[PDB]
Amino acid sequence: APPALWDLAADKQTLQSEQPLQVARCTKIINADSEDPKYIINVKQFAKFVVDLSDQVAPTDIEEGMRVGVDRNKYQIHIPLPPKIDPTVTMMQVEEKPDVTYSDVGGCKEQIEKLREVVETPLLHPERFVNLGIEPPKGVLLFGPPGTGKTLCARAVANRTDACFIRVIGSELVQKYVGEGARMVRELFEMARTKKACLIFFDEIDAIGGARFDDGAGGDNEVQRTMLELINQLDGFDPRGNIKVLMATNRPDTLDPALMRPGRLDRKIEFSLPDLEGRTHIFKIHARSMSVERDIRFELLARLCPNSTGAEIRSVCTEAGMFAIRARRKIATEKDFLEAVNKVIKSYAKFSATPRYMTYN
Amino acid sequence: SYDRAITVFSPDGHLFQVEYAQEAVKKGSTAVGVRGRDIVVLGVEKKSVAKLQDERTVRKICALDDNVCMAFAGLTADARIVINRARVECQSHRLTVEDPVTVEYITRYIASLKQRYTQSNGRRPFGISALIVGFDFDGTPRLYQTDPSGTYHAWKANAIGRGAKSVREFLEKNYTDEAIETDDLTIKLVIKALLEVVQSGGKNIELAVMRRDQSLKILNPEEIEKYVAEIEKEKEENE
Ligand SMILES: Nc1ncnc2c1ncn2[C@@H]1O[C@H](COP(=O)(O)OP(=O)(O)OP(=O)(O)O)[C@@H](O)[C@H]1O
User: Fold this and answer.
1) What is the spatial distance between Cα A275 and Cα A273, in angstroms, rounded to a whole number?
2) Which of A254, A291, B140, B201 satisfies CB 3.0 to 4.6 Å to A211 for a cystine?
3) Contact B40, B148 (CB under 8 A)
């Protein structure tokens, strides 16, 4: 209440400052200009208003499609308001704060290296690649076995140099509203160019990328709104973009978005996935988990779990501590959990052996 | 939709119709068996006898010869196929070269025949397995197994079916090296596993013992009825 006392007591200066700008209702878009003084403007009341502008604002600052203030009495232009947009749709689009730093990598070197130089390196040293130009590529792509998905995008969040970047997923842009995706991708780059340093990311393009055409009834044609328009908006020249966006998905499908990207995008890499000598790297970050006995050999259990990435062997050190408390013991020796690891691979392969070959085949 | 392959097999590291046929093995009727210097014992359970039907039609053990006994776990459909098949095989073997090959010819017959049975097109692999019972020449025991992949292997103990039948083979490892020096306790192991395995009904349990070169006969409810009483007495001697 003491913080709310002086807080509520400030209305004396408020009502004095409430009289000015009170008439700003409502936000109105202009249309065209025949001469300098008079412009036609349209407001959400559905009523269009021709008016001149107050002497406090220069006429050159009024551009076609600019929402500006108003005086409901005189209808004259008051103050411009930068945002034209957008109802909702921002809260799931905007992503802030870091997490998942670079130390979480599972040993992949050349993979994470060449996708680091497409984003982090150009922005950290802009003069480098400009003098070294040539020209940076227009985009990237990610897909393969699930490990490691969606984490590599989280890697750039904690490695972000200055300002947070935008995350977008496909299913949030579904309709209901059609045309937001166009309007969205246009404004985020216009918002970008001011401060630059804002990445655009899209996830799960496979579901929304259904190609190409069917007899009827569509069907895929309403899905063509998502795939074709997004690629088309990516296909612009501006610039395009400064952050060179990003792409991530599950399967390479479909053919049409896959044949469109080589004309624009670049750097298509296939997971990778652990190397036989790289499975111990995910065990290195897990070697700091709980208390690890020095007799444990990570090279021994690595070969026993093929195609386990970092997700399935994350359960190894989990089942380690899992059965540790079940048995009331404290640490977990190699032979302890690996006896359960040979079970966790086979018993979980009874219903599905987790192949990815059958997905695209 | 339905996306799957058949043969062979899958990049995921495991076959399809083979290790999946092992599910049709482990789901088979619970059966056990042991080897000995003189009398070899076997067993079968989980036949779901309703007491109202005839026991000889559900019999799970046949004999190609008096020397070699057949024990299989799985459906009884493909059984008579193999019964007709293998009996003619051991017959044509009896025909020329009267002295038969010892234990390495017959165990590799069904095994290799089942391996090529997964080889050529238009041949669906069997989802059943089998374990050969009998006695090798010169007083030695013989036992082996059949695998969906066709790999023949010899076991010191026969444990299949549910987890309750695996305890019967666990009790054999508790007899160490010396036991048993009497055939009474070796038969009683089946009478003790009768309570552990299945529903403990005292009905589906059936066994036969072959002492040396003497052809075995199915146990009548007299001997096995007397050895069933000592099974509970021998467990009470350990208390
Ligand atoms: N080599 C690795 N190093 C670190 N973490 C890994 C590795 N491999 C897998 N993981 C972890 O396994 C988890 C599971 O990945 P997940 O299944 O979410 O990928 P995905 O996003 O489904 O892939 P896709 O988008 O291609 O379907 C991830 O959170 C990731 O952190």
Assistant:
1) 7
2) A254
3) no
3-state secondary structure of A331: coil
Identify any residues that bridge with A248 across adjacent strands, giving them in sequence order: A203
Cis peptide before A198 (omega within 30 of 0): no
Q: What is the dihedral of CA B105, B106, B109, B112, to 10 degrees?
A: -80
Find the length of chain A: 361
**Which residue bears the tokens 């655009």?**
A200
Resolution (A): 8.0
In 3D space, the residue among B211, B222, B232 whose CA is nearest the CA of residue B67 turns out to be: B211
**Sequence-separated contacts (24+) of A91-99 with Cβ below 8 Å:** A92/A169, A92/A172, A93/A166, A93/A167, A93/A168, A93/A172, A93/A184, A93/A188, A94/A166, A95/A157, A95/A164, A95/A165, A95/A166, A95/A167, A96/A164, A97/A157, A97/A164, A98/A157, A98/A158, A98/A160, A99/A154, A99/A157, A99/A158
The residue type of A275 is: D
A contact test, residue of B1, B6, B12 with most A CBs within 10 A:
B12
- State the residue for tokens 């097999």: B9
Binding residue per annotation — A151?
Answer: yes
| 3-state secondary structure string across B76-102 | CHHHHHHHHHHHHHHHHHHHCCCCCCC
CA distance A355 to chain B (A): 5
CA distance B181 to B166: 23
Nearest 5°: phi and psi at B185?
-70, -30
| Helical (H) or strand (E) element with A169 | strand A166-169
- Cβ distance A157 to A119 under 8 Å? no
Q: Please, which experimental method was used?
A: cryo-EM
CA B114–ligand 1 middle distance (angstroms): 42
Amino acid at A87: P
d(CA A151, CA A271): 13
B125, B116 contact by CB (below 8 A): no
**Cβ within 8 Å of residue B191, ≥6 positions away:** B205, B224, B227, B228, B230, B231
Min Cα distance B11 → chain A (Å) is 7
